[PDB]
Ligand binder design. Structure first.
Ligand code: MG
Ligand code: MG
Ligand code: MG
Ligand code: MG
Ligand code: MG
Ligand code: MG
Ligand code: MG
Ligand code: MG
Ligand code: MG
Ligand code: MG
Ligand code: ZN
Ligand code: ZN
Lengths: 402, 402
RNA sequence: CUCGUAUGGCGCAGUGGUAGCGCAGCAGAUUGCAAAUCUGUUGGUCCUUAGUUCGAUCCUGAGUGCGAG
RNA sequence: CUCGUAUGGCGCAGUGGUAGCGCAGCAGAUUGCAAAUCUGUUGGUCCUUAGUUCGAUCCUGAGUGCGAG
């Protein structure tokens, strides 16, 4: 049936570079899945693949959103889906590339459609959702469908809110909605994971930040600051739209010697991003696709043509030819990356909550752990210990008085 | 979503035995997938799991077909499908068990519906399908849609015929029909493969044949012979319905000291069956389900409870709990069975035909190899060699004639 | 003692010029027969020995094994 | 050869009773913000040393190291 190739991996691994090679070799068009590359201009910091390096290969769902808009999952689901259909009905093979692996969920119905589910929210309902209270909306969720509230921490406002929002608009318990999800892969998809040891990568990711400024990043930064300014925007705005990009918010303090710091801070955010990306691919993506993925070692660039190019072409060739892949699925070196221990084994299965009646956070609320394993990690934490001691001593001082 | 557990494996591995344990533990009902256990009575030779060993667990699509009927794929697809639906709408989890792994294809749309595709075959069309000629129906296929004819040998009458039959009833090239198949798994299925080293198994399969007669197999054999008789049936009938079962046709010659031979011949057929079953599971089933299967070592029965019972329960438990399986998927010992080299690597990919203009079979037709690899195997065969020599020597007597 | 046979794991051909078939075995196939079906392929040097002959697995002699007498 | 100053990976506080803050780091989460966000958490017992006091990072005196005319 209609095939679809997807390329995943961390930043600066050659995803775009590969995507092009395959596109040419197999007659296809690229579809960006990077949540930040969907915005207008600002190519240097948003690291868009230059045109004179696309061999004319068509690109979709990329650079079209106005800095005034707020892109998101569904916006991608509809857009990415159209590109697929369109590319397919033209005898071409789609190729989705990006670092926002979260969006990839659309490729296998891992979402909840609440748009076609019209329902005028009630004054009572809304007043709860948009409540100014800290942990009140959570209690509401625990009340209606506690089997979903237990899968979230009482502080995960963004998510706890979403869940309740669903319960309202759909009038159906979100927990149930999930148990009923089919979660089946859409289209005969081929997941290619381009990977590279963290050390070598981190180095490249750093240098690619240096000559990233040399190419005139500061110009795009000031530009972004001009728009940021003349708009009365506060730093807390850097949690929406383009304002989330890694390459702007980091230099905000340099916009009130020290610019050098904003650069380091940026190099760090990038580093962390790459790390969180692997974690997702290993604990979220792979487990979701039952492990039907193929690794490509791009650690030693001096090679690439062999480890990435050829291998990717080899697998893709058998793939498109509508045949069972004979390739090893993973080179000896990265073999353990697809192991159960490195993947589904790490996923949290115990959701029972625990509230330490002795420890409390800066927000005043008492610490609440999820899962017996971590509940204990906390009990043995110096935090809990140091606090359990001061508590005992205070309680003891009185014992002595008597 | 609606889960479905399936248990595959060779004969005498404990599939039924396991199916029951799971059924109880997880509240489910068994669905037989054995093409021979679907017939009436004849339990000893058809090895039906005894009732007083089913703990009252419901069984479906098993023992209901009259010896006068001819069960087949679709017949199973509809029947198996109903049981699933029915079991599901009752809060129960279906458990399909059997050795006819071929039928399992229904679990992931690996067939072609040609019943709802009514079309009065033409006198010209029919005269070709039911042609008395040896290799004429094949030529017709090569004419219309040669891309499918090349995937079959010109002697595979049963299949070449079906392909052409499809081309007619559907008026759509069968080759195309396949390239368009989605081949997606139906229901959240869990494939459990109960395996056992061939040697220990072969031993059990043999003794299993001895006390199989002691339980009164000959009584069922004579019974089958009574019906076989008084019906003017010839041995060539043993290619249809129950007549295919392993436990009857083998004793036909003993029905015109020598019975001992018919028993050996049976132990062999069973042995071969077990071998062909593994080959299917490794080269057909697994490759088709992308390798989403879990092995259970039942080689050392003294264990079972640990390697089979517990493990199966552990995996099934996480499965039914709608959670990503944390189990290893394969015990160190049988690890290599799920390797690419032992599976998709063996599947034939080269379909180019080759006709040895020198070698010919008993039917007169010239040998035709499929796949360069095997084309060569033939060229170096003693058959081809011995024949190429007599041919040269005879031609060398022509030069001497000048 | 009569007359017979002695070929790859087993059951069988064959020819005065250095051997095939079936079965098992191994392997590929499998989209209404699948416990069925199709297809490809590895094994011996024709029991030992002395001769006849240009040359013997096949012809004669003997030995040995086995077969019904 | 007289003054300063050294506390977890880095950067800096600090009470006489056996230690913090910021970063990193490590871990769990993710079904309309995901380059985001939520959550949990490992590292040192305070340069070494003589003592001063019931007691020591925090007091007194040496020595090590760096910086300072
Ligand atoms: Mg890119
Ligand atoms: Mg703009
Ligand atoms: Mg390169
Ligand atoms: Mg048992
Ligand atoms: Mg059974
Ligand atoms: Mg009957
Ligand atoms: Mg076999
Ligand atoms: Mg013999
Ligand atoms: Mg002579
Ligand atoms: Mg001291
Ligand atoms: Zn605590
Ligand atoms: Zn030949």
């Amino acid at each position: 049936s209609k095939k679809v190739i997807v390329i995943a991996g961390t930043t600066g691994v050659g995803k775009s570079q590969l995507s092009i090679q395959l596109a040419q070799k197999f007659n296809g068009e690229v579809i960006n899945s990077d949540s930040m590359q969907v915005y207008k201009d600002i190519p240097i910091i948003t690291n868009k693949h230059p045109l004179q390096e696309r061999e004319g290969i068509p690109h979709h769902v990329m650079n079209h959103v106005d800095w005034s808009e707020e892109y998101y999952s569904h916006r991608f689901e509809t857009e990415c889906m159209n590109a697929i259909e369109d590319i397919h009905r033209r005898g071409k093979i789609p190729i989705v590339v990006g670092g926002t692996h979260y969006y990839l969920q659309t490729l296998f119905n891992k979402r909840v459609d609440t748009k076609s589910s019209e329902r005028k929210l009630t004054r009572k309902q809304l007043d709860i959702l948009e409540s100014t209270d800290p942990d009140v909306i959570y209690n509401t969720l625990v009340k209606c469908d506690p089997d979903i509230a237990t899968k979230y921490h009482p502080n995960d406002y963004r998510r706890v809110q979403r869940m309740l929002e669903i319960y309202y608009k759909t009038g159906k318990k979100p927990s149930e909605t999930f148990n009923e999800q089919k979660i089946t892969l859409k289209f005969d998809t081929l997941f290619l994971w381009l990977y590279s040891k963290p050390e070598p990568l981190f180095q490249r990711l750093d240098d690619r930040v240096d000559d990233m400024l040399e190419r005139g990043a500061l110009q795009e930064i000031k530009q972004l600051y001009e728009y940021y300014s003349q708009n009365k925007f506060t730093p807390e705005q850097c949690e929406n739209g383009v304002w989330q990009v890694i390459g702007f918010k980091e230099f905000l303090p340099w916009l009130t010697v020290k610019l050098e710091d904003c650069i380091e801070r940026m190099k760090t955010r990038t580093r962390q991003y790459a790390k969180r990306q692997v974690k997702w691919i290993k604990k979220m993506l792979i487990p979701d696709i039952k492990g039907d993925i193929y690794l490509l070692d791009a650690t030693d660039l001096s090679q690439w043509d062999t480890n990435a190019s050829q291998r990717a072409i080899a697998i893709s060739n058998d793939f498109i030819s509508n045949r069972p892949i004979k390739q090893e699925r993973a080179p000896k070196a990265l073999e353990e990356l697809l192991s159960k221990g490195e993947t589904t084994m790490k996923k949290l299965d115990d959701w029972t909550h625990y509230t330490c009646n002795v420890c409390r956070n800066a927000d005043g609320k008492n610490v609440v752990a999820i899962g017996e394993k971590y509940w204990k990690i906390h009990l043995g934490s110096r935090r809990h210990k140091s606090n359990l001691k001061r508590n005992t001593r205070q309680a003891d001082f009185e014992k002595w008085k008597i």
